[PDB]
Amino acid sequence: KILHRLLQD
Amino acid sequence: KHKILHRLLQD
Amino acid sequence: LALSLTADQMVSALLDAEPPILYSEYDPTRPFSEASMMGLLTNLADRELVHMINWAKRVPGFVDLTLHDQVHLLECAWLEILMIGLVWRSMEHPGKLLFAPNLLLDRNQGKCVEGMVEIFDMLLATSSRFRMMNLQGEEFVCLKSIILLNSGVYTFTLKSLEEKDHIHRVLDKITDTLIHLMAKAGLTLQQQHQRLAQLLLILSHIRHMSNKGMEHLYSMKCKNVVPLSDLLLEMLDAHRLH
Amino acid sequence: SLALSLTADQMVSALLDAEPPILYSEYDRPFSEASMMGLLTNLADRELVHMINWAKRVPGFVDLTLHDQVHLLECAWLEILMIGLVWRSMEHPGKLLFAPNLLLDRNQGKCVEGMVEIFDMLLATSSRFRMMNLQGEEFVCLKSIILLNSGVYTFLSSTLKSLEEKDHIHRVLDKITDTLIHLMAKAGLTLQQQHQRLAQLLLILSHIRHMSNKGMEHLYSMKCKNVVPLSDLLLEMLDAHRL
Ligand SMILES: Oc1ccc(-c2n[nH]c3cc(O)ccc23)c(O)c1
Ligand SMILES: Oc1ccc(-c2n[nH]c3cc(O)ccc23)c(O)c1
């Protein structure tokens, strides 16, 4: 879910 | 070391 | 000499070298298990291997290479070569893999074997892609020879480096043959390079499948699921997986 | 939308200034396997953060759904790291320039079990790039082809929304092809020569894929061996390949 989060920022 | 690939690549 | 051949010479050469399509030992009086499933496919692979070795020797320029180099290229490429054959044959059976005319499997049949459904799924995906690109017999044979000459090439004192030049020159012809086929079919020049890139980008994906299937087979082997022919064993030991 | 409308020179330009920076390692003296593998993974980790931002700048890439961009980095990440490494090392025969302060030669890769073979492959690739006199503008294109190509067949959904997703990625990839060819036309290459070089370039991406697969196993075998404390993000990128 970190990658997920990092793509949103 | 007598490998089979080796061998068949001669036949 | 492979380098002076025209494109129609090159394509016939590759078309007449094509191996046969083999039949599986399939025993439908037998049920299915991971084990019988895997026995049937590794028997098939093993026989398909012998033909390959002979198909390879009729690949223009291939017999030019030293035996160490030839052994090495085949050691690198054998499963991709079996996988691209497979995907080619399955082209016209959507959602099934035609391992052999008497062994046509769908993905639910994959379930039998631990680890297979991942690989099967890839193999179907690629078949679909081939079918959506309307990939042609003539283009297939070139793609196959590109896999044999390329896949091992980067993993090679003096004769060593002049065998490199040589493979590269033969691969430069197959590219020529590819484009000329695409010109002959009436693709625009922009469509020539676009299609050419697409068939080549699929080779990257076939390599990923070979690497996974190699690991997959290795589990099978290390789990004593199926006995492996010394030839398949040697092919497998080539890639020192762990 | 506007990704497809781009000219060849604007694609090159888009890519050239999306380029991430070169990062630095950390500074020594004797190398254990632990310290070594710790410097390389600390490095990989920081580099992934910048890559996520480079992907977002790559034309057409943010047009894709969150899940599909996720999937594409999941598949592409170590290849992307690797082509950047091979590229940075072109100008240094025999050494891998991980970081300006971390330039390692073959003998030093025998500090870590198993990574010497992979080292050699990375060397071979760099040497090949050198042999072709690869250009920075071909490099940035190669690197985008990898982002977009590497996960695209492993999109298995048969929904309407997902087919035009693939076609879009397939249309972007066609532009990047157009551009590579544009670059070679500029260099004054004949037509035959252009198809030969394109061919040569993309065949190399097959070797980079194999390299990635191998480095991925290697990285999984260190994770087990509890040598290196890997970051969370590297763990979860690594965990994407046993899914
Ligand atoms: O994970 C895998 C991948 C491929 C095979 C395989 N086994 N047998 C085959 C015969 C072919 O013509 C093509 C592929 C195979 C296999 O037995 C396991
Ligand atoms: O088997 C491998 C493969 C790659 C790395 C690695 N570690 N750190 C890296 C930084 C890069 O820019 C490129 C690759 C790496 C590694 O530590 C082990």
From TrEMBL, chain A:
Record's superkingdom? Eukaryota
Question: Where does the protein end up?
Answer: Nucleus
Its annotated function is as follows:
Transcriptional coactivator for steroid receptors and nuclear receptors. Coactivator of the steroid binding domain (AF-2) but not of the modulating N-terminal domain (AF-1). Required with NCOA1 to control energy balance between white and brown adipose tissues. Critical regulator of glucose metabolism regulation, acts as a RORA coactivator to specifically modulate G6PC1 expression. Involved in the positive regulation of the transcriptional activity of the glucocorticoid receptor NR3C1 by sumoylation enhancer RWDD3.
Family membership noted in the UniProt record: Belongs to the SRC/p160 nuclear receptor coactivator family.
Quaternary structure per UniProt?
Answer: Present in a complex containing NCOA3, IKKA, IKKB, IKBKG and CREBBP. Present in a complex containing CARM1 and EP300/P300. Interacts (via C-terminus) with CREBBP. Interacts (via LXXLL 1, 2 and 3 motifs) with RORA (via AF-2 motif). Interacts (via LXXLL 1, 2 and 3 motifs) with RORC (via AF-2 motif). Interacts with APEX1. Interacts with BMAL1. Interacts with CARM1. Interacts with CASP8AP2. Interacts with CLOCK. Interacts with DDX5. Interacts with ESR1. Interacts with HIF1A. Interacts with NCOA1. Interacts with NR4A1/Nur77. Interacts with NR4A3; potentiates the activity of the NR4A3.
Q: What is this protein called?
A: Nuclear receptor coactivator 2
Q: Which lineage?
A: Eukaryota, Metazoa, Chordata, Craniata, Vertebrata
